[PDB]
Amino acid sequence: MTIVHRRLALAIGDPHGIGPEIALKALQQLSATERSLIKVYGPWSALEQAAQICQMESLLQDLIHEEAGSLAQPVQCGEITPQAGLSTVQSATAAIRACESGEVDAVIACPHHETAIHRAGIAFSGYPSLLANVLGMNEDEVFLMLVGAGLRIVHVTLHESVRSALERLSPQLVINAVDAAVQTCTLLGVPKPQVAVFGINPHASEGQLFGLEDSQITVPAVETLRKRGLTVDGPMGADMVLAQRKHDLYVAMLHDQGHIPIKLLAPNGASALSIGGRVVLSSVGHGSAMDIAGRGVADATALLRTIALLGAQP
């Protein structure tokens, strides 16, 4: 039962958290063929540490690895340290640049601890932002696509107030997001997807009865996309379209429009993809779990589910 059909970069996240642990446990479960498609980015010391704990010493030899985020002192399982914050970022930075340059086709990032990163002096508002910085893009040109229960919902805005989101929406922004998410769909194994665009306002404005935004923003975006030769329905009322369940990719205007479906239908088995240039970075949708770090009791299910998704055949 083979889940990895392409080259992937795995960055092991906070070297003090469960990242290293779950990395190894997840490579354990693969055939050797599959393991050699996964390049691991992170400090060797932490993978040593997690191996002695998990009793997986055999698997270090049979592992493709690039040193990133090296440590100047021994690993301290469970401690929040400025150093470990830097490791995380360097490791993730490394894997992204191997995707950017084409050594791999996507990145998976193991958990971070935000305190550790802040304490290192690094601005971090998530993987959308980090991914932008590293690539030299604007933060509004990288987007978040959630994937769970077969719904793929890309978000035009994310993690700002509604108002701020509203005063940023534009025909161009929607277009960029759909383009990013369609190139991503090809990676996920839906090369030619049928897209549905959510309305900004309820019922997609209902012409212009419930506001003018849709007529100014979504409708002109949809026309452009169709002309470029994409199959694209809408704008339609978010509630209505999601119920039909007849699309491969939904496009949401506001955070909640996309996050409510996903976390309702797949509250732990969802994946969060950051999409920018040709880089698709997914998180493993759990924290660094410092409380259990180094006790070898951390589950890799989420990491395997994430690999299965970005490692997909079509």
Place this chain on the structure above:
Amino acid sequence: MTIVHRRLALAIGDPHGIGPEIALKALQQLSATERSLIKVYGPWSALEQAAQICQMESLLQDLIHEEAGSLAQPVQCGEITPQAGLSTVQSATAAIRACESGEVDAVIACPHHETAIHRAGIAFSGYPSLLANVLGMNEDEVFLMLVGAGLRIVHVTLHESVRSALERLSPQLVINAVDAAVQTCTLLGVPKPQVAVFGINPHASEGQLFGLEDSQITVPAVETLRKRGLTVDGPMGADMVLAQRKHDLYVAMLHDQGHIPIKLLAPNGASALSIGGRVVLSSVGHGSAMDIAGRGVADATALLRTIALLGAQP
């Protein structure tokens, strides 16, 4: 097996559609005790017509009835006529005023035909609005509660642009809506409900990182409601709370926040409650079905499900 534990007004909707039929079929299935709790509002001629068709003449004597929406000519099963549009409205107007004055505790409206009403010259944008007009209230003082798959979600705003909705939210507005919906919960048979309030902004603002609205609007509303002695969690990120599924009443700020959960999880089996000034009005959630009007193929299940909900025991 008794589903009606209080006094209800049943308005028979379009007197040409299946309303009359399903009314009678639905009263058929009740005990006589339960039938005397249900006052029927509509033209007698149409209930006569539907009774001769269905062969239920015995049940007209055993029926509490108030003439509303009288017709000046014989009933025409299946025809869209200006007259029948007026009947619907008069009947529904009547039942609401019997709730308003306290003769009954809630109203159920059988199906309407929008064309018929428009052709009579009457503005109708739904039961929220009609209920406002009849009661002499502002349309933002009536609130919509959707009910389906166990979720009860009251909406603070509804059927206006996000922006307009945003610039109307205020501590008082939230409070009004929760009060209305908690009174309604008592009718629905959850006297002492555990409430969750959705954030305006993603993640309920995250302190004030994602905007100030929540700190100005939802937090001050929640504090007030707790002090009045209500069990009330939040504000919380809509996506997060709905996933826990640990509450009897959710409170949504924007239309979509509430309508996406419902239509996704119960695209067929759901109820829309309009709430204002002691009145709870539900529809039956199917159209008037003119093509089978008088042809005795219409089942009353949806009408009975609606009665079971508004007729619930304390």
